[model samples]
Target: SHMRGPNPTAASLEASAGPFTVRSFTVSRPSGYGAGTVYYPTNAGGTVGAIAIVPGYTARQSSIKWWGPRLASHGFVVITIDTNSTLDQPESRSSQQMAALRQVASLNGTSSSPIYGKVDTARMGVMGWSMGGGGSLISAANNPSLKAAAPQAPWHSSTNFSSVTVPTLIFACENDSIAPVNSSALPIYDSMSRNAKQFLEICGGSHSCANTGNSDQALIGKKGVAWMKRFMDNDTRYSTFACENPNSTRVCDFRTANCSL
Candidate 1:
């Protein structure tokens, strides 16, 4: 049912450097995206999955730009883009996230594109920060085809993502004033009733707590990449990286249900 390497987890997906050197190129105002910055493993001689990242209110690609390199370094092709408008809401951001994914699929089929034949379009994922995180959840809920999700301090208007069948990982900033963990992040996570889902609260962090270049990146970044790799690639060896170790980390308080991924 899924395409996997000879061995799913003979190595670590959390490491910044994998067997392939990651390469970067821009998609330049691709249709349906304000901007596109792509990061992919240069040596992907076979089909690999891709994930799209979106930014929150008044934010652009730079805000959540870290995921591109972080996830791409492991194995997945990543696209980080700006919404047509920086201030777009959750629902709008959700649509843009899906749009970025469609563009990835197109690039895979375009012979002239750098990513030609590299993307496993069926094995896709979505991620974001804040309202963009809310939109990631929305995208997951609205599109059952989407395989995985990781949202940071997500702020959504509704908790109806109960229908999201794909695995999800939510990063909640403990002290986030804008999107408090209780009202927003926790509720969205609580509403999920199918597939596998895990929630982690980063202690002592603020609204801007997630992503790379942060004090918690060592652990936060590892979990984010592992979650996507496990579910999106349908690999179980990455499962231990997704769940067990985090509970022992001082910086992360974790919880999960049916998290076989």
Candidate 2:
């Protein structure tokens, strides 16, 4: 089955630079998330570049509502897939989450399908929350389709972090108990290879703070969205803005630099 939100309006576009279009559909993969949603900025033409967003464990697509719209406004065709499985069947759900990433891009005809000509497959990127964060890294490490990745508050595991070939930015929370700063987030940062553009943003908030309802959540969302624009848009200047300005409070420099990172 499928569900779609109202088509974006010109006024809405002006308010946010683009209209937000959200759609839900199914994937044939065994991932616990039998269905997923795509959100995009509706230009007069159609959807723009494609982005795949993986939701954290036990969470739904709505959790990514904040970042999805912001990215869409910046001209990204964004997707948020469900990854929750039955209480005792977490393993199957995780497997499905990985499979759906490939399936979302390969599925035919559907607007959500990555095969659509409007989607710049070469410019694809992935973002995930919590457990989905770890999965995003694994997916990007193993799949060439994903040119960049942002794994926010990732849960830890033994997977080789050196395997992630794409530029990765990690968003870590300051007060998260489940994935504490030193244990879960730091280790992932340490494992990244020299070639990867690894970053750490210690947002002063809780784990769920990255979602919504928290003051710093928007700040965290802005960082992730900016990272995607820099790498995926080939806005070389913006891509390196964060690294160059590690000490600066700003995350992007649209006018001053060019691919320096």
Candidate 3:
């Protein structure tokens, strides 16, 4: 098992932070993306997986920046990025996300870099908000090797993503007017017929329910970290954490496939 931390408990994963000591640095030279902040654990016992996150259309990196420390503290190297332009579409966001991962891989090999030798480039995941979520799906589809993907209230032009085989976990907002779950997140999730996947809709949530400011951090953070650990690190210790449904009233709808204990 690639599991890096002590055994996880419901309370531990639900907490605002994890057990690792985290540190961050600004990317002086972003490879193919715009500016980025790299958050990583100072001592994770060994190299860890990397995840690149992008913001939605007309949104800055701060919109999705919360994911940086959230994931990194749990034993992953996370990069939250800004697009070349805030107006960049999902496809462009997709490219930038991958570029961010590429840069992380490059830095891992650079001895002078802060995250040097700290990441397992082969084990990576993608995440985003809205259009950036759409970009995560596209990145998973185009780069099937990605270990996992967890997109929040994704907004994409097309509802079809049948070709994506990467393990996916879509975070949907119950009342998302911008990219309603029925037309966007749900359909996109339903289109995938292969590999492991999950859909979790937060009750009474708006479009930003899963973004920076919304209130369901405990459950959201738990599942996000669990998903990455289960798939990206291939850690079976997180199987139940990643697959079991949280039967709370806070969850509106939930679904899972090919994820069995």
Candidate 4:
């Protein structure tokens, strides 16, 4: 009587825009960062992993803001922030992301904070777009405790994430004039020698070709949520998702390693 479709645990074939209603709020004086917005499942009934997302090169939270609601609905606590300075480099952004995570963790029982006890401070992840994305990679390298990472259209001057052991996801735009995939995303993916990793290059190419929900959002939204869920939650329910290539016509390129959790 249970023979209907794909298994619920390995929600591999499932869409990741998520199945639950979501809630969001803003934060100021959030530890070491300038400002932040928090998102989470309204039905969190229990604590969940937390993530800090940053924007790149003069970009504001609006650039990667969509990830908040999308991931939160999937039961993750997501924080999207505006750096103290928009022109901050990748390393600087990484520092900001770290501080943001610290702040998210510090929100417990603060009385005025809505996130008190809603976040599992121990399980954390990092993500970004452009230079912010590259910083996410750096943060993972520096903080091996991270559970997962997903950076969209990342950009960095070099490929030195050799120390990153955190499970990572790299989304690329072939036509990115801002930061060519060959010079940036591809090399970064190649540098990570340990832990689970993946690369998804969309068929289309645009510098702003990635991010959450405008055109390619649905496809990336699925990949992003799956990567975080599979690794951060350590739930094998998303194994087929992080390991096997999606047979769907969503990617121009997809590859993975050590991802069969």
Candidate 5:
């Protein structure tokens, strides 16, 4: 099994940080993207999967930077990136997200790189906020080899993502005025019938509900890590964590398909 940590419990996954010792470096020469910070675990017991994260329209890396250490500490190589232009749309963000992953793969093969030989390039994932969240969907469509996708308050011009076969987990803000659950997240999730998928609506959350500074880290962080682990590593140890409904006040609505304990 590619699973990196000890058996997980709610208390462990819900903590602010995981067990791995994390270190990071800024991308000196980004490949096909703007700026990036790569966070990695110095010792994950084995080479770990990689995840690339992008911010929403008009947002920079800071908006989504929190995910870097949060995920890396849990045993994945995480790269949080800034787009070439803050105004770049979802399509541009999609290309850039894959570019970031490509760069991570390169660094893994580069002997002098900090993350040298430390990444499982074939096992990669995508994550983003808002427009970048939409870009994650587009990334999954463009790269079917990707293992998993977790997008937060995603916004796209169209809601038809039936083409996405990658396992996906959508984080929706119940009170999101920007990309309301009913109009954006829900329908997009509904369109996918070919693969495992989940929808988690944050109660009383805004557009940034699942973004960097949300108040529900215990629930949001747990689900994000579990989803990536369950799909990217085929780690069945996380099946319950990834599929079971929280039934907590933090979650307004939850749905899952093709995911079973």
Candidate 6:
């Protein structure tokens, strides 16, 4: 079962801020029982960089609808995949999600996969929400191809953070019950290497509230966009600011900065 929303027009995205093209693709697992969707952008010249996104447990690619057009408009080729398990096979779902990423690369240039030659395999990033957040870190730690990662509302421990060699950003809510601040966000921040860039935006909301269609959801979206621009887009201007101080006030210069750790 697969569905797709209207692709945001290049003109609409440009007038809003930037120009981006949107397309959605579906991937079926070998077992045929598991499947997911990939949403990506076609660049100005129709070129695209490689990006893979993973959704949290029970969350589908549709949940990240706001992200697909936004990132694509900013000139990145993004891919968001739905995890295999929503309730029954959580652990195995993670593995299948990772496999889906590899499959995307393999299918590049082949008619079977939507990836084609659009992705710059050398420069890749991974992002996730909640449990998918933890899964991103795990995948990045194991895959050298992953240049950076940004995990939102991560549920894993500091122990997992230690192994993440790629640059990382963590976004969380101050009062998230599913993954509390002290237990989940803070520890992950503390565990990262001093050389690795880390950013934590503590929004004044509850678990999943940042993602919810609340008043502050726009703020949440901005924060994520800025992080990806700085880290994934390698925007030196923002990176310089972010690197100078993981907790810098300059970060607030962009509408993206909500709160930092």
Candidate 6 on 40-91: residue-level lDDT in tens? 6554553445566666667876665556656666566666665545652334
Model 1 agreement with the true structure over 1-261: per-residue lDDT tens digits: 453433434235445555556888888657776888989988756688989998889888887877787777767899998888988888988888899999989989999888998888889999999989999988988898888999898998886688899789998888899999889988888999896899889887799888556776667777887788778987776787886546534455678988753
Score residue 87 of candidate 4 by CA lDDT. 86
- Greater-lDDT candidate between 1 and 5: 5
Model 3 whole-model lDDT (C-alpha atoms): 0.94
Off by over 4 Å in 1: 1-14
For model 1, what is the alpha-carbon lDDT of residue 254? 75
By TM-score, how accurate is candidate 5?
Answer: 0.99
Q: Which stretches of candidate 5 lie over 4 Å from their true place?
A: none
Candidate 4, residue 55: the lDDT equals 93
Report model 2's TM-score to 2 decimal places. Answer: 0.73
Please say which candidate is ahead in lDDT: 2 or 3. 3
- Can you give the lDDT of residue 4 in candidate 4? 16
Candidate 2 C-alpha error for residue 50, in Å: 2.2
Residue 250 in candidate 4, Cα distance off native in Å: 3.5
Q: List the global CA lDDT of all models.
A: 0.82, 0.57, 0.94, 0.82, 0.94, 0.57
**Tens digits of per-residue lDDT for model 3 on 1-261?**
577998888999999889998999999978788799999999899999999999998898888888899899999999999999989999999999999999999999999999999999899999999999999999999999999999999999998999999999999999999999999999999999987999999999998897776688899999999999999999998999999998879999999999976
Which candidate, 1 or 3, would have the higher lDDT against the true structure? 3
| TM per prediction | 0.93, 0.73, 0.98, 0.92, 0.99, 0.75
Off by over 4 Å in 6: 1-17, 28-33, 88-94, 112-114, 212-214, 240-261
lDDT of 5 at 24: 92
